[PDB]
Amino acid sequence: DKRTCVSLTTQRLPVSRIKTYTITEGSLRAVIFITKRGLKVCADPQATWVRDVVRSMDRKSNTRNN
């Protein structure tokens, strides 16, 4: 079934702890980070630190992609 974020984390998450991410878009669109051990934290897609991580990951999953 569908899962939506109700609350967004209020603490930044180190890129050095994220594994992957997605961007579900409901009434409360958000970036769902998946920590290296399985936790799923929602974050503001508008937050600078989030954007920074989303980029850092795309730029780290690109070079590490052929």
Add this chain to the structure above:
Amino acid sequence: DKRTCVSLTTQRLPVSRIKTYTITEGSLRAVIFITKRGLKVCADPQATWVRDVVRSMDRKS
């Protein structure tokens, strides 16, 4: 030495328990009911119940 009232009781005293009495003026004008067991109690003279206790005690004084 001398004694004063800094506060006036909020509860009533049963007249069937006030041995003596005495009014005191100065800092805060008050009524000082002494109980049959000793203990003293500062009350308000403007307080309705108070006047009722004095007068029903004055029939014996």
Add this chain to the structure above:
Amino acid sequence: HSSGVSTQSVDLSQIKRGDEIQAHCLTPAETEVTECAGILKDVLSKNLHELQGLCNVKNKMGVPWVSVEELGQEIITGRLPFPSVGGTPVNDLVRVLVVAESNTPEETPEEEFYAYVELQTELYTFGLSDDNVVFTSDYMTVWMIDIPKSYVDVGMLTRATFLEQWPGAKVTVMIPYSSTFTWCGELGAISEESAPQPSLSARSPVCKNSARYSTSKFCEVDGCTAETGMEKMSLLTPFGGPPQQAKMNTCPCYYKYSVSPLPAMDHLILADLAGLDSLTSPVYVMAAYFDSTHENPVRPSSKLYHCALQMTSHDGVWTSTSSEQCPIRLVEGQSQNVLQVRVAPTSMPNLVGVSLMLEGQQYRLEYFGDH
């Protein structure tokens, strides 16, 4: 019985000037006793107990007489089981109506009826003075007073000092929680040699161990999944309790504190109640919450709101009544024998608590804390 919980509908239309009593005696209006004391003088002369019909819920407890011989006092003191968080400082006040009374003796005694009632909190101690009376009668006095809402909650001890142990002596604090819900806390006096007799009223911190719900880590284990329908029910009603069983749901805690994706659902079930088939009096459900809309981070202080719902039996079918901004609703469950308290998942972060009030039972569920 010296204790228990009871309910009843309250139609202000069928209440002597109730329309007015509500607005001038149970609402913080004129700061003088003039207005209210007028309305009650007129109405209580005809029917001495017209006020009893204003209590939607009545939670009474038996407290023993305590004597202070030196001063010839007969005292009864007790912790009223306030059904909900009183409020916040940023809130306004609530006009409460205190009432001391007792049975009218057969032979007129020599001493008349007198009672000093005080609602003492930590710092201050609100006293009901002569300047607070709004009505008197041979064996009953009614005091009016405005107390800041947050003062009216656990921590506020109720003490009533008498000079005689009048039979049937009791003190009642009528506490309006909303424009249409009034809870009456009652202290009924009982033998000095009797232990305090509390009503079946409990307080449950549904979300004890808040940290646990910061993420969906324990969802599977806690039993909160799409599979179970976000329902992990646990009994509120103790074993020998009334035949109406009440249950609470812990899962809402995830929807209130989690920053993890949770199953998308229209409503969560905060609690349910069975036994409606044999329940005669109504059921009240009160919610406490914040309206974080239009908040300023620099001065983020919101007011705590309260809405109360009522479920009633009509032709074997229970239906719900509602308040305006109420985040919760009551609807029939799996059968006519059950009712549930539904709320929207997105409302959980601002929901402070919900309380169940019905015959012989009162449950104050809170979503903050550990006690």
Add this chain to the structure above:
Amino acid sequence: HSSGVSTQSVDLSQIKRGDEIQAHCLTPAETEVTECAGILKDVLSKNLHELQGLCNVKNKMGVPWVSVEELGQEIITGRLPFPSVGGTPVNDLVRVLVVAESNTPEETPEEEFYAYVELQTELYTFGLSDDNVVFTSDYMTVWMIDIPKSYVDVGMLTRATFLEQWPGAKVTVMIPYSSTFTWCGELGAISEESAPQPSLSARSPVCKNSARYSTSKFCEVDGCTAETGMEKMSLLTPFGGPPQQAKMNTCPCYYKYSVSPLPAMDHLILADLAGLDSLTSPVYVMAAYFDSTHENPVRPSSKLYHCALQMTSHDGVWTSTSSEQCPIRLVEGQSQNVLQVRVAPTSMPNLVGVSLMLEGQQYRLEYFGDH
């Protein structure tokens, strides 16, 4: 020196734009960070630690780092030893400045300095968001926020989440209590393997079992007569440790709660302090009291007030600031080495508590409460 207590005089005239800071930064004014952020960007960009001079009293405590590997968090949490009762629900708000800093590492680090800081109470958690920031630096951030005074007291937990165990990390909460008095609660981070190191700060229910002081039945026993000059002193300073010994008097309780006639004396000694001859910094004494001036018995809404006095050593001779509308005053003890806190017996009923603050010690004396 992980923990401790320190004081200093505060000359706003000697402080770079101190007058503005304490009016748009430490006072509930513009509901926008803009003003204060303005003053602070100028002032702090020059003299970085300029805010430190506004702390009349600083009370720091060493608190162990608490890791959360899964989230890469390094948290420091602690309950500040608030000096006095925050306030009543009737009071206004107090604007606080929350600072988070750390030492400037000699070599540029990987990550940048970061810290989320929340002030959490039972019902609400005031998070200091980006919308609250009024200043930032490579290794310092200052937030600002208005909170109802009553929330700022014991019960408020201070929580600081970081991402690295920044050497020198510490969260400070500058809390004004009056126009001339600002108390700063500092949480200094210490080894994760260390034990909490709080400061020598005690809270004391001077009038425990207040029902005892309702009459003068226990004056002879408690040693509170005229034979004793109404002085039942008790050491506040533990052991023969800190060279300055402070003492409290329990007799004031009688003058606060007793409705019996008590001795007549122009003053009472609420407390005293010895060791002024070796004390190299100023002593502070804050009284918390309710305004006497009779209110409406129907709506007893009363505000809580705070006033701080300052004792300074001028050539070995100690003098204090004016106690204009402050119920208490500081005078010289038997020697220049001793100092006393004096008060009129008449003002005890409305006195809530007095706090003593000096080098290494802080004593919060409360006249209400039983523990």
